[PDB]
């Protein structure tokens, strides 16, 4: 009971995917999640209550 997902694209602008099967009983044995790419800068660059529209003054 296998999974097929896409490969990271290389040297050019269907054969661009790979297949994987897990052979172990523990999730710890699995390979790394190198393909997950989320992001949320907000937690850090903009943790202000009161939304700053910035195109407007920011004070006044």
């Amino acid at each position: 009971g296998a999974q097929v997902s896409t490969q990271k694209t290389g040297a050019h602008e269907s054969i661009i995917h790979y297949t994987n099967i897990n052979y172990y009983k523990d999730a710890a044995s699995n390979s790394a999640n190198r393909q997950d790419f989320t992001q949320d800068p907000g937690k850090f660059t903009e943790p202000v209550k009161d939304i700053m529209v910035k195109s407007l003054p920011a004070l006044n």
């Binding site: 897990n22 009983k25 523990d26 390979s31 949320d40 937690k43 003054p57 004070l59 006044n60």
Partner: protein, 238 residues
């Protein structure tokens, strides 16, 4: 027995490999996850945060809060340039130990626009306009306001909005530059000039400080992982 051929690579240990491996603790019940605030997901989230630039990294300020203060003052000093520095985010002293810089040093390539925020810290009664310029490579650093204004620039008017943002757009022959920058991947310089001096009423200090923050814009990325030059040791029990 199923027929097999071992290929070159068999039995090697590649630091950056990515294979499954037997667990030495079959069925271990891991402790439940807890939702902690502040989860980080990509080092770029950190590089996108402003951090204070040590612009005044002159001999003697290396261990004092001055390295962070850009001196500016009342009176006629137009000919006098306020400051200037190269745009080598991962290499020049001005940037390398910055939040953006420390991160760039774990990589060999970078690309993207940079934000330089300048904040005025004089009294509220102080006044003034500055010219913040960025010159793409190819010529030497502007030596006068005349020369500097021929490049990318904002004219900053000190007012209730204490801060002004000079954004350095990505202009390069290549899509990427070396973090360990060379002349081939030069990025130019930014210099600052009095556009119209600092005027002040009586009873107020005639000189103040301007601070400078740096951070990456949203078109910024880095590639090719490598170790940092910044940390080392002579022996274990580290």
């Amino acid at each position: 027995g199923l027929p097999v051929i071992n290929t070159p690579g068999s039995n090697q240990f590649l630091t950056s490999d990515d294979f499954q491996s037997p667990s030495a603790m079959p069925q271990f019940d891991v402790t439940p996850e807890l939702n902690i605030p502040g989860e980080v997901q990509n080092l770029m989230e950190i590089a996108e945060v402003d951090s204070v630039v040590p612009v005044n990294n002159v001999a003697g300020n290396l261990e004092t809060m001055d390295i962070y203060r850009i001196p500016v003052q009342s009176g006629n000093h137009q000919s006098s340039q306020v400051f200037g520095f190269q745009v080598q985010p991962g290499l020049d002293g001005v940037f390398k130990h910055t939040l953006l810089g420390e991160i760039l040093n774990y990589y060999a390539h970078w690309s993207g626009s940079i934000k330089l925020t300048f904040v005025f810290c004089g009294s509220a009664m102080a006044t003034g306009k500055f010219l913040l310029a960025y010159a793409p490579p190819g010529a030497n650093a502007p030596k006068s306001r005349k020369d500097a204004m021929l490049g990318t620039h904002i004219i900053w008017d000190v007012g209730l909005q204490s801060s002004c943002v000079l954004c350095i757009p990505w202009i390069s022959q290549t899509h990427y530059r070396l973090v360990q920058q060379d002349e081939y991947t030069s990025a130019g310089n930014v210099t600052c000039w009095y556009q119209t001096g600092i005027v002040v009423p009586a009873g107020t200090p005639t000189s103040c400080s301007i601070m400078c923050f740096v951070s990456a814009c949203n078109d910024f990325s880095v590639r090719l992982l490598k170790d940092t030059p910044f940390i080392q040791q002579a022996a274990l029990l580290q």
